[PDB]
């Protein structure tokens, strides 16, 4: 008979300490939950004490036992005699925090054992499930426990320590120049100055109307990151096959007309440039492309983890685009699906400590305004994305709407939400002949 690891002594000590000391409840409150107790009477006692504490009522022996008696739940717990025994047995000079931590650890271990048993039972009786589904199920089961225990890292911090850390960070940024770049280099001077690079562990959202160069801009960023670093760069393309992406990349890097490449009308110099580009790419060998359709966040996260494990770090992750992703459990409501996607992306960004650039799209309502430049509210149906995003960039091109625009070949990257810097608009040159973005050499305002 397997014996699950349960510490009845720790739970009894916690209960006795709470009865004999009501000031420590908060310390217990941040270490254990009601479901963490093995026996049903202990869970019921904790729930009643939580209700009393939230109502302002004392949690002494008489009031707790009486409250259980009034609701008729005293008999299930064990009685006033049992409550008095629990109160009296526990010595006053006890550290409730240690016992609470032991109880907290035991619940995690019990959940792990339950998940292992579920996986084994599912394997023995597949009920038509595939091996891939079982592997995904096991990964999800383990990651659920990991996140269940990955919530203690968030809480209040000391004011003086925060101030000292902020001062140290300011000094360090002014100490190590890097010419204004602290994160992953974007390959553009003005964007680097306004962003200090692409900060690791931050979610980046790129949004625009159709035909604005969103995929083009993302690919230019990816190529710049690959050429200016050594860590691998991963691309998730749910909308294009990898061959078209590579053709676009060849047009951008070799500065050859995309139509010529697509139709094959290339001369000797174009072939030489393409050979040079291929040689550089094969010498570097740090770009990975995944053109699978109907991607799920689990597959994206698993592939990112595998790349980081294989190569010891990821320079940048790119997803195009998140409106094509699916969560099967929440297909009924799109807003819940989007929230789950955003949460999973943020968790992946935190876990791998990498910059993640996810592309998004805007509704037609933006085009109902006289000024079509995007704003934050144009992220309707994706509020969780706007909240969880650490950087938000919108792409705008005036020449798209106006033929006679004076800004032909000029694109605007608008920072609608920046976590660690200022917002503003950056103008760049758009060479659609080469399918590329470049630094703007004209006057800046």
């Amino acid at each position: 008979l397997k014996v699950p690891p349960h510490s009845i002594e720790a739970e009894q000590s916690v209960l006795g300490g709470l009865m004999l000391d009501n000031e420590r409840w908060d310390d217990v409150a941040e270490r254990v939950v009601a479901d963490d107790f093995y026996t049903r009477p202990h869970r019921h006692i904790f729930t009643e004490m939580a209700r009393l504490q939230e109502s302002g009522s004392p949690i002494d022996l008489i009031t707790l036992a009486e409250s259980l008696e009034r609701q008729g739940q005293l008999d299930s717990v064990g009685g006033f005699a049992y409550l008095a025994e629990l109160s009296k047995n526990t010595p006053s000079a006890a550290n409730i925090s240690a016992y609470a931590d032991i109880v907290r650890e035991r619940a995690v271990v019990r959940e792990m054992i339950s998940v292992a048993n579920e996986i084994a039972e599912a394997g023995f009786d597949p009920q038509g499930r595939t091996s891939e589904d079982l592997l995904d199920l096991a990964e999800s089961r383990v990651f659920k426990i990991a996140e269940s225990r990955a919530n203690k890292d968030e809480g209040p911090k000391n004011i003086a320590d925060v101030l000292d850390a902020t001062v140290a960070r300011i000094e360090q940024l002014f100490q190590q120049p890097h010419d204004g770049v602290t994160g992953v280099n974007t390959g553009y001077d003005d964007l680097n100055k306004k962003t200090a690079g692409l900060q690791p562990s931050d979610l980046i959202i790129v949004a625009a109307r159709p035909s604005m160069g969103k995929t083009t801009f993302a690919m230019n960023l990816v190529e710049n990151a690959a050429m200016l670093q050594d860590k691998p760069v991963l691309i998730f393309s749910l909308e294009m096959p990898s061959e078209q992406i590579m053709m676009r990349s060849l047009a951008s890097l070799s500065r050859v007309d995309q139509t010529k490449i697509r139709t094959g009308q290339l001369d000797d110099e174009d072939w030489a440039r393409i050979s040079g580009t291929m040689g550089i790419l094969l010498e570097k060998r740090n770009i990975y492309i995944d053109d699978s359709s109907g991607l799920t966040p689990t597959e994206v996260r698993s592939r990112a983890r595998r790349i980081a494990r294989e190569h010891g770090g990821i320079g940048l992750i790119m997803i195009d685009y998140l409106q094509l992703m699916r969560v099967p459990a929440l297909s009924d409501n799109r807003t819940l699906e989007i929230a789950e996607i955003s949460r999973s992306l943020k968790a992946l960004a935190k876990e791998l400590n990498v910059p993640v650039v996810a592309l998004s799209q805007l509704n037609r309502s933006l085009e109902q305004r006289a000024d079509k430049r995007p704003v934050n509210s144009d992220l309707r149906e994706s509020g969780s994305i706007e909240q969880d995003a650490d950087l938000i960039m919108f792409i705008y091109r005036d020449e798209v709407y106006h033929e006679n625009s004076d800004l032909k070949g000029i694109a605007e990257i608008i920072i609608g939400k920046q976590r660690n810097g200022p917002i503003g608009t950056v103008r760049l040159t758009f060479n659609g002949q080469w399918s590329r973005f470049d630094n703007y050499a004209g006057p800046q305002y």
């Binding site: 320590d161 000292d164 850390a165 001062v167 140290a168 000094e171 360090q172 002014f174 100490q175």
Partner: peptide, 22 residues
Amino acid sequence: NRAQALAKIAEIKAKFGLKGAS
């Protein structure tokens, strides 16, 4: 200049920065 800025940085680190610091 830069040297004076770094010197003042170190001075402030000594004056207020403690325990963790950098």
